[PDB]
Amino acid sequence: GSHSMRYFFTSVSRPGRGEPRFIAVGYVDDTQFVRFDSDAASQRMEPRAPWIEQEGPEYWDGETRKVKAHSQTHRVDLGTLRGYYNQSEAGSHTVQRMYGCDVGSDWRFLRGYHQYAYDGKDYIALKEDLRSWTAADMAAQTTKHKWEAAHVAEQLRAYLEGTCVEWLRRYLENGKETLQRTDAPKTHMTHHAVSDHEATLRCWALSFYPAEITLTWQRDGEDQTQDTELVETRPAGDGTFQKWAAVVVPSGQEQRYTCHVQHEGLPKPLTLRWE
């Protein structure tokens, strides 16, 4: 399994209603492990997975230190962006940032990210090379220049290839039961008659980890991609995900349709049928 640590930060200005809000969450694969929310009593980085709790005063203090410094930078960022777009002081705005790293199955550095958006649109993004930037517009280009000059990407490689990878692995090591598991999907199908001449056939995938899964319906071998209702993979709230694919069969045609489920935890992918 390939693994990833990503961190997500959201800053939203509240004109008149104080300091902006900064929410920070971190993730290893589909498991969230930490959080920070400006509007909280705490004002500390909190654990959100059992395996990080044990870490230590030092861990928790340093991450509180850093997340609060990130908080302040994103709210210096917010005013600068207002200037770069010479916007009102009355408007709310949202910046969002996401950085992290991916390791393959051998747990070595595979990919490094750092992207930044403003008002739900790309603003600037480090490229896979981890030295150059993709500046969306003129403003993102001023910013690009600034970071070119201060050699910020040189410092970025240090974190995403050293520390991010180092810690992700530590996190895999230390959260082994959660993080190195692969819960294979529990599949089954439903049949409810929509009418006299047609019926819904729904293929379920339940209690699985990681979220990556393909749920495909077929009729006589033909892909049914234009005719499948596919819901988005949702969380069950216990660290597993759920998903379903449905088709409306002309009655009598049930034995033509086959569901197909592919997930990291399934030795060979499943083909299911109503019979």
């Binding site: 961190y7 850093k66 997340v67 960022d77 600068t80 410092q155």
Partner: peptide
């Protein structure tokens, strides 16, 4: 673990 970085746009 978070980066310690204070670079703004």
């Amino acid at each position: 673990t978070l980066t310690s970085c204070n670079t703004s746009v």
